[PDB]
């Protein structure tokens, strides 16, 4: 008298992090299959016949389904590996769909209220069971042939279907109604305790044979890895093992010397800490490569107007991290061309210590049509809702809309997508922060895009001789005599020059012979002069 395996326990299941979801799934889908049959039959109830698991990809959805399958005293589970049923001839997909349920019907007709459970695991239910609408080809027929089997004129009572998908809203609505796939669970990214348990599960075996050094710690690794997804944790452990093993392929077995040195192999903290920086790069985490590409030549301090901007950025970050009545915040950086607004946004973003940071620039969308840009922006904004903190940077706003002064001309659709997105708070609890960057504030003011933003900041140019001299001194060019001559010539008047244009005039002037350098630099600076 048992429907479950006589011997089992959860601690052997190999799953770690998903505790409450498993408890709820058991309560719903297994409460009425483990009570004594007499009471259940007296009640006159019917068992649940569906489960739908959805969430971010790579967090252990397939594993839970396979382990629920290998759980029971049920026969071995069948599998429909996604698009394995499609065919070219007329009326062949339906044969494939109908072939699955044959054994269940046979047993139900042969026995009654006594047969053994049958489990069908359906991978990527989204691939085929799309909305039933125009024609879609084979989609409309397969969906009907499926909906007409789980609950039809004839009654089945010994079946249970599991459906896995990462996008939940593209499944036909009818399918997801009480009576067919009913209980739907979400598996998300794990927090600290989940990472601790996963690392223990994946390191126990090494620990068993003493192969693990005493220097390594697991709590520190759990703390330092944030927004890692399980698969990435396994990858990290494998990378550590491979690095440790390769540490010996050049010392002991390379020279074919006594393996005792090779047999003293032991993975240590060095392997992990040197493998956390050059092998694994999360998909929902900070990526320390772009910031080294945007702030090309550092952030020098040419005067006051840098400190104020940085302080304001810090204040905005601090506000967005510790407030409950204001989850969504925004800010706009603006100024004249060639002033530095993509090298002061990156710094503010990178000095926040948020677990998620992303930059969406127009440089990686050359040739795209409008809908491609819309779906790129929406995809980047989808991720930030799946982490408990974030910062998304929108760079060069005026090149996204495809602006051009003649006309004027621009893309309406991108503007509407942007205006709707700048006023959408994330699901309950989470936070956000958005930074912009533009050079034509007024044209933005015309389109009514300064109502969405909650503040603005101003980045100025070099506007006095002293600041130019300080910038030249810090950059490290020209000598004492040349410095003195430049100071005496340029002190009287005033200058108005950006800070990404000075780095070009310096180079253009540093290409003549030593005698004419200062003269050419002064001529170039004078010619490229103007006033507000």
């Amino acid at each position: 008298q048992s429907i479950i395996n006589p011997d089992w326990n959860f601690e052997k299941m190999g799953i770690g992090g998903l505790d409450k979801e498993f408890s709820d799934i058991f309560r719903r889908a297994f409460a009425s299959r483990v009570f004594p049959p007499e009471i259940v039959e007296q009640m006159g109830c019917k068992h649940v016949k569906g489960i739908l698991l959805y969430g971010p990809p790579g967090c252990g959805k397939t594993l839970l389904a396979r382990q629920i399958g290998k759980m029971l005293n049920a026969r071995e589970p069948k599998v429909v590996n996604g698009p394995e049923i499609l065919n070219k001839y007329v009326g062949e997909s339906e044969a494939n769909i109908r072939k699955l349920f044959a054994d269940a019907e046979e047993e139900q007709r042969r026995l009654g209220a006594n047969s053994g459970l049958h489990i069908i695991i359906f991978d990527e239910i989204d691939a085929i069971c799309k909305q039933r609408g125009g024609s879609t080809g084979v989609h409309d027929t397969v969906v009907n042939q499926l909906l007409s089997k789980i609950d039809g004129v004839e009654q089945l009572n010994n079946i249970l279907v599991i459906g896995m998908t990462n996008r939940p809203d593209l499944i036909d609505e009818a399918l997801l109604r009480p009576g067919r796939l009913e209980v739907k669970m979400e598996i998300g990214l794990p927090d600290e305790k989940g990472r601790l348990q996963i690392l223990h599960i994946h390191t126990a075996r090494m620990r068993g044979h003493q192969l693990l050094s005493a220097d390594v710690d697991i709590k520190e690794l759990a703390v330092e890895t944030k927004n890692f997804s399980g698969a990435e944790l396994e990858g990290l452990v494998r990378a550590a093992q491979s690095t440790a093993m390769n540490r010996h392929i050049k010392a002991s077995t390379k020279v074919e010397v006594d393996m005792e040195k090779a047999e003293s192999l032991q993975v240590t903290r060095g392997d992990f800490l040197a493998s956390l920086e050059n092998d694994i790069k999360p998909a929902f985490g900070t990526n320390q490569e772009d910031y080294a590409s945007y702030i090309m030549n550092g952030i020098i301090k040419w005067g006051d107007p840098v400190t104020r901007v940085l302080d304001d950025g810090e204040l905005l970050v601090q506000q967005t991290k510790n407030s409950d009545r204001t989850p969504l915040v925004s800010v706009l950086l603006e100024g004249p061309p060639h002033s530095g607004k993509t090298a002061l946004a990156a710094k503010i973003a990178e000095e926040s210590n948020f677990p998620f940071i992303k930059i969406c620039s127009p440089d990686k969308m050359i040739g795209f049509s409008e809908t491609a840009k819309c779906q790129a922006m929406k995809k980047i904004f989808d991720d930030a809702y799946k982490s408990q903190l974030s910062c998304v940077v929108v760079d060069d706003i005026e090149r996204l809309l495809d602006y051009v002064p003649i006309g004027p001309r621009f893309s309406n659709l991108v503007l509407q997508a942007l205006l709707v997105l700048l006023k959408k708070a994330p699901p309950q609890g989470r936070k956000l922060l958005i930074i912009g960057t533009t050079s034509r504030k007024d044209v933005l003011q015309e389109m009514e895009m300064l109502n969405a933003f909650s503040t603005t900041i101003h980045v100025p140019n070099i506007a006095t001789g002293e600041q130019l001299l300080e910038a030249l001194e810090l950059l490290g060019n020209f000598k004492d005599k040349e410095r003195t001559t430049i100071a005496q010539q340029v002190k009287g008047k005033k200058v108005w020059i950006g800070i990404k244009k000075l780095l070009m005039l310096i180079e253009m002037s540093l290409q003549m012979d030593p005698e004419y350098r200062v003269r050419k630099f002064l001529a170039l600076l004078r010619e490229e002069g103007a006033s507000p």
Partner: peptide, 29 residues
């Protein structure tokens, strides 16, 4: 639109029989 499906037809080969029975039965008799 790309989804183009097809129907099909079949043939046979056939063999010889009808009077071999008579010869076999006559031999046995």
């Amino acid at each position: 639109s790309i989804s183009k499906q097809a129907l099909s037809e079949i043939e046979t080969r056939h063999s010889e029989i009808i009077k071999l029975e008579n010869s076999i039965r006559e031999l046995h008799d």
